[PDB]
């Protein structure tokens, strides 16, 4: 199956998702001069007081935090979005080392990690249905860059021995979402896809300017994880992000002058 390796990685996913050629790919790489102050985005509301977190994944890929999706508790509306997206999970890409691991760039440069929030819109009634849709995904991304501890992140850190190995989980409930943030919420938007297969056309991308720091401590925990099961020789998770993917016939929207 699919993952980040020289054998099955983003170069060869095209042979299985036809759609890794399409026309709005992501990561992309963010021209911050070409970028275009946009009026018409409304105040971008992030709601995440009412969050009810659940469990924490390895999935062979990256470690996933879920949530309870079932009402509507944390969401993220205004901004680009019409509507109401529900947060369903986090994840993020990191690097072997600190100068790469980011997805989208910025001016091309590459930061040591970034985390994706994961929404889908309510209208459409659960993911599957939602990801059938070109408005299906709203994923909020920030970037981390390297140098003092993040607090709001070192309960995540912590965990991550409980959860080497592909397959393994354990309970994350009454984690605040919200300790994750920088304090702006300065961003740029596009229309993209899925960084992972199946690589779907239905995401928007809202992408903070505001990079949140972390310390090299926590990032080196996140490089301890593997992509293999138990017992199967140790391939260390690193290096799984997507590098940026064409533009084509994108424009991307700042939310400041
Ligand atoms: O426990 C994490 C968070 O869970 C939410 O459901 C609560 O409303 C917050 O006050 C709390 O910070
Ligand atoms: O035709 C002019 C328009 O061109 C578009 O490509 C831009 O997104 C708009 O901001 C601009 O007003
Ligand atoms: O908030 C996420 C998790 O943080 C810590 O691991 C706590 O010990 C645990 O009870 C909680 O589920
Ligand atoms: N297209 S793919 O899912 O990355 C893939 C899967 C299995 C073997 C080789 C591959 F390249
Ligand atoms: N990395 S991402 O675009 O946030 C993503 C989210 C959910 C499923 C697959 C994905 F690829
Ligand atoms: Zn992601």
Request: neutral net charge.
């Amino acid at each position: 199956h699919w993952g980040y390796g020289k054998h099955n990685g983003p170069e060869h996913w095209h042979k299985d998702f036809p759609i890794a050629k399409g026309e709005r790919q992501s990561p992309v790489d963010i021209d911050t001069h070409t970028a275009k102050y946009d009026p018409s985005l409304k105040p971008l509301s992030v709601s995440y007081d009412q969050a009810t977190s659940l469990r924490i994944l390895n999935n062979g890929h990256a470690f996933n935090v879920e949530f309870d999706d079932s009402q509507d508790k944390a969401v993220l509306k205004g901004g680009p979005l019409d509507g109401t997206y529900r947060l369903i999970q986090f994840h993020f890409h990191w690097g072997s080392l600190d100068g790469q691991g980011s997805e989208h760039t910025v001016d091309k440069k590459k930061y040591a990690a970034e985390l994706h929030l994961v929404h889908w819109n309510t209208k459409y009634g659960d993911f599957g249905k939602a990801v059938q849709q070109p408005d299906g995904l709203a994923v909020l991304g920030i970037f981390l860059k390297v140098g003092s501890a993040k607090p709001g992140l070192q309960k995540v850190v912590d965990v991550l021995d409980s959860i080497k190995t592909k397959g393994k989980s354990a309970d994350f409930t009454n984690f605040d979402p919200r300790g994750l943030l920088p304090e702006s919420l300065d961003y740029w938007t596009y229309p993209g896809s899925l960084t992972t297969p199946p690589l779907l056309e239905c995401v928007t991308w809202i992408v903070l300017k505001e990079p949140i720091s972390v310390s090299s401590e926590q990032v080196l925990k996140f490089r301890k994880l593997n992509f293999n099961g138990e017992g199967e020789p140790e391939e260390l998770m690193v290096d799984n992000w997507r590098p940026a993917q064409p533009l084509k016939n994108r424009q991307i929207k700042a939310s400041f002058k």
